[PDB]
Amino acid sequence: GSAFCNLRACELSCRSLGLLGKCIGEECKCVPY
């Protein structure tokens, strides 16, 4: 939102599920790890 998505940054947010972070359609997505 307002600026473009980073994936190291998305990975840091998805770490809280134990997931793997990606960006998809300019929003962070966590996939099961």
Side-chain angles (χ1 to χ4, degrees):
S2 79
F4 305 118
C5 64
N6 189 263
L7 197 147
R8 171 66 175 174
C10 285
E11 283 259 52
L12 313 198
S13 296
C14 297
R15 203 99 305 134
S16 285
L17 294 169
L19 295 231
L20 198 78
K22 301 300 181 194
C23 187
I24 302 293
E26 283 292 330
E27 293 297 345
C28 289
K29 177 67 65 165
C30 309
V31 298
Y33 248 65

